[PDB]
């Protein structure tokens, strides 16, 4: 072949923390099809938003939005339990089909994005240059999002474990634990990574008895 | 400057599923220092192994092992709760210091790896070429590991939720759920991604009442 039709930029979705998660890499030859399973981020969440992105930046807001749609009707479940399979499918014609399917109900929603959508050649080359220019700042953002996300998971799991512990947890530990939870919930709202790590560390240091109780319970 | 001293290859650690998680990217100028927090993969795990890697492959076993060491003394806790902070620090002399610290106890262990360790120039260029040659197969492996890991998390969380539900779960659902758990536990041992996804989907389809109970409990 003298040519190849290729994706000039990565294609993906926005995920927890405001980051772009890539489903099809930059420079993939078409046709191609890739899927990844995602879940809900909150207890009893009934809908998830699929925001389709094109570009190479780590911050979703720094990429080109190709559109969005919601999958609703998700049944009541703890965060992290439902399985929403997201498929990016680019056919021979260069048309992008993005689908989200709830694996429990088999309910599906789709967006179709024609071959001419997204960034033009001038914008693609600016995108490529910016991603390279900003590699370092993008890495810092990605490390912060990972920290915040782990903090959020620890916040919620620890709250659940306090409840299941009930009376087994000494009153003094519950006091120490609840204060550190408030402090971490506050810190998660900012973008100071060190502060999140410090509240996470305070939690770990005061939760040792809770931890033993939770392990014992299962 | 007419030169820069740079990392010719990524540096990282082996994480759940046998994958390389990168801490310092290929082509980073030294000195540099980066950290990421990790956790345990099993309930009541008392030690984690830090296996240091150099290279660009997704499979840890396809990279150059720079050494390994264990952090023990982790206190009894549910999987996913303990915070083990891993720091990769390369000083002005090109020496790599890797430390793991338990944020609960402040217990730390380190490996020091001198500037001359790892792959020589012939091996680095073979590594660079192989990673490029194998981009596709490495992507397939990474998607499989992600699937297996999500399966493992769903396996364990669902077992925990059955226990906390106790009598609230109807006997018939518990039967359906326990069968699907056995089937998924089996599937996680292989490398058939579709099969893992099919057992995960069977679980989701039979767990809707359990899910409602678990959400209700918190």
């Amino acid at each position: 072949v003298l040519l190849l039709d290729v994706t000039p930029l990565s294609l993906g979705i926005e995920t927890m923390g405001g980051v772009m998660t890539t489903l099809i890499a930059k420079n993939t030859t078409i046709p191609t099809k890739h899927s990844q399973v995602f879940s809900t981020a909150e207890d009893n969440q009934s809908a998830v938003t699929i925001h389709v992105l094109q570009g190479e930046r780590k911050r979703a807001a720094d990429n080109k939005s190709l559109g969005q749609f919601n999958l609703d009707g998700i049944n009541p479940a703890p965060r992290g339990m439902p399985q929403i399979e997201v498929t990016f499918d680019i056919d021979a014609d260069g048309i992008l089909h993005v689908s989200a399917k709830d694996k429990n109900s088999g309910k599906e929603q789709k967006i179709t994005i024609k071959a001419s959508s997204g960034l033009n050649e001038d914008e693609i080359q600016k995108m490529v240059r910016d991603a390279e220019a900003n590699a370092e700042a993008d890495r810092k953002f990605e490390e912060l999002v990972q920290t915040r996300n782990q903090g959020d998971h620890l916040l919620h799991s620890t709250r659940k474990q306090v409840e299941e512990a009930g009376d087994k947890l000494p009153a003094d530990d519950k006091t120490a634990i609840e204060s550190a939870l408030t402090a971490l919930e506050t810190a998660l709202k900012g973008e100071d990574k060190a502060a999140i790590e410090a509240k996470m560390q305070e939690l770990a240091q005061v939760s040792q008895k809770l931890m033993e109780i939770a392990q014992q319970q299962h | 400057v007419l030169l820069l001293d740079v990392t010719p290859l990524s540096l990282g650690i082996e994480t759940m599923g046998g994958v390389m998680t990168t801490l310092i990217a290929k082509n980073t100028t030294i000195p540099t220092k980066h950290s990421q927090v990790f956790s345990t993969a099993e309930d009541n795990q008392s030690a984690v192994t830090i296996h240091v890697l150099q290279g660009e492959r997704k499979r840890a076993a396809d990279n150059k092992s720079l050494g390994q060491f264990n952090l023990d003394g982790i206190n009894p806790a549910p999987r996913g709760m303990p915070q083990i902070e891993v720091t990769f620090d390369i000083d002005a002399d090109g020496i790599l210091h890797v430390s793991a610290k338990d944020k609960n106890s402040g217990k730390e262990q380190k490996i020091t790896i001198k500037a001359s360790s790892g792959l020589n120039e012939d091996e680095i260029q073979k590594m660079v070429r192989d990673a490029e040659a194998n981009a596709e197969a490495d992507r397939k492996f990474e998607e499989l590991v992600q699937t297996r890991n999500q399966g493992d998390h769903l396996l364990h969380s669902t077992r925990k939720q059955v226990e906390e539900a106790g009598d609230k779960l109807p006997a018939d659902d518990k039967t359906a759920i326990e069968s699907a758990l056995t089937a998924l536990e089996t599937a996680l041992k292989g490398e058939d991604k579709a099969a893992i996804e099919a057992k995960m989907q069977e679980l989701a389809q039979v767990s809707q009442k359990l899910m409602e109970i678990a959400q209700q409990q918190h």
Binding site: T15, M16, S39, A41, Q45, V48, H153 | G80, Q150, L154
Partner: peptide, 7 residues
């Protein structure tokens, strides 16, 4: 709302 990881 946003999607997160399966745990």
């Amino acid at each position: 709302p946003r999607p997160g990881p399966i745990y």
